[PDB]
Amino acid sequence: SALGKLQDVVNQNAQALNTLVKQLSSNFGAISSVLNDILSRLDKVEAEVQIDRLITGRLQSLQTYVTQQLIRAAEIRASANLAATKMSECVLGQSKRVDFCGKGYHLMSFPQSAPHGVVFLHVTYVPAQEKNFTTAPAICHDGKAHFPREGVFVSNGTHWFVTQRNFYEPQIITTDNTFVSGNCDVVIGIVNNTVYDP
Amino acid sequence: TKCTLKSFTVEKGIYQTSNFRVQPTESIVRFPNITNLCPFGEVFNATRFASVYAWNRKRISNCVADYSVLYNSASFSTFKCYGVSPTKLNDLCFTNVYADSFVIRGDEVRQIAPGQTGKIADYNYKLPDDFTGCVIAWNSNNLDSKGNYNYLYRKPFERDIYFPLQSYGFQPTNVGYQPYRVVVLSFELLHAPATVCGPKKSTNLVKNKCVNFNFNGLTGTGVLTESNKKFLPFQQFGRDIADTTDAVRDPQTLEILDITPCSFGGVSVITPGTNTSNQVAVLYQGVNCTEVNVFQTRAGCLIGAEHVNNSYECDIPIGAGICASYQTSQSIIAYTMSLGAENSVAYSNNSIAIPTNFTISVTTEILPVSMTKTSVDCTMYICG
Amino acid sequence: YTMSLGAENSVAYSNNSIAIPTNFTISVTTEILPVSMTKTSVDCTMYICGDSTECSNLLLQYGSFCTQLNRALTGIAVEQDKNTQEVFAQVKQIYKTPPIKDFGGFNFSQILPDPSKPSKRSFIEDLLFNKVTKFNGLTVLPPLLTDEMIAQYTSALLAGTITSGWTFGAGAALQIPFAMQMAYRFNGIGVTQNVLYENQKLIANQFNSAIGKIQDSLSSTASALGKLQDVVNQNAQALNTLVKQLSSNFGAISSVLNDILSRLDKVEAEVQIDRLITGRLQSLQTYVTQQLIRAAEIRASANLAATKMSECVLGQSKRVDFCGKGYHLMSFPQSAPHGVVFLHVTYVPAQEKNFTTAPAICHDGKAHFPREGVFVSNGTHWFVTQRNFYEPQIITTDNTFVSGNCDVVIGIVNNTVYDPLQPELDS
Amino acid sequence: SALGKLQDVVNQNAQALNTLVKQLSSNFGAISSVLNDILSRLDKVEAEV
């Protein structure tokens, strides 16, 4: 059932061909649906009144197939243009587009072929095993407010560290990890800790 | 379900197989309660008939007639009917009927036909292109063939009282050269009070129960009730957008009956796979359970599935937040679908959660790209 | 009149002039998308014939022409729940907000759910629900998700977004303070995060006031819902056209099929009824073809709305003019009848100053280039500043990197570049 | 051939119009496809069929 879309596209086209074939058996108001019954039984003056019912019916029944195949082809073309867009952005690159290249943060994708379709094996970094930390938007030092260059400030409870947003890895807060702007009085929720100068 | 799918195996799902309809218990027949017998003997056995330029016109009204008495008579050389069949006339009725009466040559009977070509047809007696009624005629060579030289000829239904005067010559020695008397019965199917009707007796009226009614010829299946429809004194019927009659004045008690088609709806059959169980549940769409282990959903009355107080992922979707599944000793159950586990995020103005680890996930995504390249020889398909 | 294309603007370009915005406006550009349409379903025999066996015995002579219409409309009807599912059910847990609404000054009370209601829509969702407004074998089926379940999914997406940002799009929701989430979002548009903290009350007041103007737009202007009311109108116009085609004669003596059967014997009546079967079947095939083409147009809109949900709500978008107008900060989903509405929050830069500028600066023979931002001068002193908010800083070996020498670069200018390590030694 | 998409969108819409125009000449089972060659030859009751 993981293949469900490709098998559905096979089944719809097989069901449409079978329905178009079965419609040859329908009478449409002629004396028989087997055309050679009409042509053997009726003279070619009476017979045209009967055969034109089968032509009217079978023509309408072919247009009903072709119209649905044109609409179904547009639905497959919309999927092929999406698959070509996934091939370009997701296999040939790496995507910033959330949930485009599978759930998680996208790393890379490997294309595999399948009957009437394509299958992408999207490789994604999913973050796991959280810890809760106390946090602050900035650090006061010499009245200067310091903000993080990369990542966020966090505390284990006793000490203040800076760390990257998506993987806990604590670093001592320094003038290399942080940049100054303005002074302590301006920022809601700023906290006091020493900022180390290497 | 197996006959809807044309299959002996059915997958887990819901299938729109059939339509539930309450059936008519009895047939209810209503006509004007009037008992005079129509003057058709005065029309068909008269001593003299008019010339075809002049043609008299009886109006028949306020009376009852049997048309089968005319249709089974050996007297008539034709009985051709248009917009009604002569077998049906006794089951059906009309606001007015008219009988046009006159004498013609037998070579000209086919000029008394709707829209047909001819000298009598254009100058003095065109039947409308959209006629409804019957042409009845007989050779009158026993009465009009004295010879006799009197009967005279030159928009539809218009009388026309060198010379504009030409007349036939009828001798009893003359088949197409003989005189014929022709009667044309024209029937006034207005959406108005009937006054000329077939011999068929009316029943008593029935209400709230489903019936196969007939009012004045308006055959139809439906529940009849009294109504809030304040008809004005001249109104006989009401209609829906689909032209179908939607109320009627009763032709005897003169009250304003509602018509509602008897309680009906689509049937969906809810099933696990036959590859698992032959037990099934049924949804009667869009109906209260009162006309149909029974559970009113907002989609319809659901029968044969147990209502379960829990919530789960939607296995077979029914509609309006309800789903069904086959579960534990096992049966079909119906439940309000779960949207997901419920989670208060531990937010506060100074708390952050940072992941200490990761999992590399690989997710398969499947996309169609190209369907089968069918191609069809439309000449061989249509013509073999 | 000949239509105006817009006001004309000679941009003040010259090879050494730059305009830098000294200030911004937070804006909330609403966007409205159809997602689903009325799940119609038809009994093709009850439409074409309707309670006549004398007609059904003729309609059987047309074969699967009837049952493939039921098949086609079932295809559309089951797909409208797929469209609704893929747009809203992008989250596997129902997130809910904390009891205390300490969101750093931002006031979500007009977009979070209201307990005062039988279906717990938000205040702006009640405005959106107000502005959008048979016996002939035709039927309308209910959606799988009720408007109360849709309102729980928009609350889960929104309570996720407010408490945890993009992180619930990847894993389980990671809580973060909303004043720190907006500082991530400002780095996302290349604006230095201290531009949030040093303006946090202003940014909160601009967001709160922009949410104020959404309620005024949606209260005053019913044509705001134009794309959704259009889909409701087309799916009603198509049903009324289909119902009116029951009254048409198609060349029969009447369109009332019981007034053929009561008037005519089976020799004559089979000629008349086949004109009504031929006509009504052509009318039903026309309706189903219109609905298949119209359903493919709604599916393209649902796949777009699911993409807007994934990229604008569960993330932040680099894609210009995709999530609103301006540089994108975040979007909040709101449900509406047969659709979704996104309240796209955006940073729009607002109050320019004109500056003299240079691509590089010569110090002692070395050419210095900016690490972040651009060089500018007020007319006497040279500064470096970020591209999207005027914040001038002293030009230094921390702000800049060297390459080559002065000879290589068209339009380089002379200045001192300060090196903080020198007075750090010499003090 | 570089402009091929725009030129083919111009071609398809022109071929669809010529197909629709040509179908005025088809008989569909009438005695003639020229409507006036029915109305000038058959009386306005026989002509209706």
Ligand SMILES: *[C@@H]1O[C@H](CO)[C@@H](O[C@@H]2O[C@H](CO)[C@@H](O)[C@H](O)[C@H]2NC(C)=O)[C@H](O)[C@H]1NC(C)=O
């Ligand atoms: C918070 O983190 C700091 C540094 O990781 C911890 O401080 C260290 O604690 C160990 C003993 O557990 C000492 O040997 C180190 O010398 C300490 N380092 C410093 C810089 O003092 C601190 O214990 C952690 N606190 C909590 C509550 O986990």
Ligand SMILES: *[C@@H]1O[C@H](CO)[C@@H](O[C@@H]2O[C@H](CO)[C@@H](O)[C@H](O)[C@H]2NC(C)=O)[C@H](O)[C@H]1NC(C)=O
């Ligand atoms: C951060 O540190 C500063 C000093 O560096 C603290 O300022 C003192 O605050 C108290 C209480 O308001 C005043 O009585 C003192 O006069 C302040 N001292 C100075 C030197 O200004 C400040 O309160 C600390 N903030 C936090 C959040 O801990």
Ligand SMILES: *[C@@H]1O[C@H](CO)[C@@H](O[C@@H]2O[C@H](CO)[C@@H](O)[C@H](O)[C@H]2NC(C)=O)[C@H](O)[C@H]1NC(C)=O
């Ligand atoms: C958040 O904003 C809402 C309005 O958008 C505030 O609620 C309204 O407050 C005014 C008075 O200021 C009342 O007249 C309205 O009746 C309130 N409306 C509703 C729906 O409650 C709300 O007070 C603001 N929150 C804070 C913390 O200021």
Ligand SMILES: *[C@@H]1O[C@H](CO)[C@@H](O[C@@H]2O[C@H](CO)[C@@H](O)[C@H](O)[C@H]2NC(C)=O)[C@H](O)[C@H]1NC(C)=O
């Ligand atoms: C940036 O623009 C905003 C307006 O978008 C300015 O804020 C307004 O400032 C005036 C006084 O200068 C007040 O009367 C308004 O009430 C303020 N509006 C808001 C929403 O707070 C802001 O002062 C400008 N900042 C700079 C540096 O120019």
Ligand SMILES: *[C@@H]1O[C@H](CO)[C@@H](O[C@@H]2O[C@H](CO)[C@@H](O)[C@H](O)[C@H]2NC(C)=O)[C@H](O)[C@H]1NC(C)=O
């Ligand atoms: C360009 O900006 C600089 C810095 O703001 C201005 O230089 C200062 O000018 C004031 C007097 O207006 C002096 O008190 C300061 O000591 C100057 N600072 C320095 C570093 O020299 C400069 O005036 C501005 N120029 C223009 C044309 O506005």
Ligand SMILES: *[C@@H]1O[C@H](CO)[C@@H](O[C@@H]2O[C@H](CO)[C@@H](O)[C@H](O)[C@H]2NC(C)=O)[C@H](O)[C@H]1NC(C)=O
């Ligand atoms: C930047 O400053 C240097 C001097 O510090 C300028 O170099 C002088 O340019 C003139 C004219 O070309 C020469 O006559 C001198 O011999 C140059 N001096 C040296 C030491 O090379 C340079 O032209 C200035 N550039 C700009 C863009 O102002």
Ligand SMILES: *[C@@H]1O[C@H](CO)[C@@H](O)[C@H](O)[C@H]1NC(C)=O
């Ligand atoms: C974080 O701490 C809060 C304290 O109330 C707790 O409810 C929550 O479950 C914790 N989350 C994790 C992932 O440890």
Ligand SMILES: *[C@@H]1O[C@H](CO)[C@@H](O)[C@H](O)[C@H]1NC(C)=O
């Ligand atoms: C956070 O909220 C508490 C009260 O719940 C308050 O004491 C504290 O000052 C607030 N800090 C910030 C950063 O808003």
Ligand SMILES: *[C@@H]1O[C@H](CO)[C@@H](O)[C@H](O)[C@H]1NC(C)=O
């Ligand atoms: C006409 O009169 C004859 C007797 O002269 C009678 O047998 C016949 O039934 C009458 N027909 C009608 C229509 O009254």
Ligand SMILES: *[C@@H]1O[C@H](CO)[C@@H](O)[C@H](O)[C@H]1NC(C)=O
């Ligand atoms: C019809 O007959 C009934 C009795 O059978 C009588 O009560 C009713 O008033 C009559 N209606 C008319 C219109 O004469």
Ligand SMILES: *[C@@H]1O[C@H](CO)[C@@H](O)[C@H](O)[C@H]1NC(C)=O
């Ligand atoms: C389906 O039924 C067959 C027996 O008819 C059985 O062998 C097979 O295992 C079943 N499959 C499933 C998925 O239950």
Ligand SMILES: *[C@@H]1O[C@H](CO)[C@@H](O)[C@H](O)[C@H]1NC(C)=O
């Ligand atoms: C069903 O009908 C009964 C009366 O016949 C009524 O009490 C009940 O409220 C109805 N329920 C619905 C959902 O129509």
Ligand SMILES: *[C@@H]1O[C@H](CO)[C@@H](O)[C@H](O)[C@H]1NC(C)=O
């Ligand atoms: C479901 O639970 C409610 C109480 O929460 C109770 O009133 C109702 O009778 C229960 N129904 C069933 C079928 O268990």
Ligand SMILES: *[C@@H]1O[C@H](CO)[C@@H](O)[C@H](O)[C@H]1NC(C)=O
């Ligand atoms: C910048 O200066 C030029 C001087 O001609 C002026 O035309 C232009 O309007 C100014 N632009 C802004 C944003 O102030």
Ligand SMILES: *[C@@H]1O[C@H](CO)[C@@H](O)[C@H](O)[C@H]1NC(C)=O
């Ligand atoms: C800029 O343009 C002026 C003339 O408008 C010219 O004198 C100057 O050399 C140019 N500088 C650069 C860097 O192109």
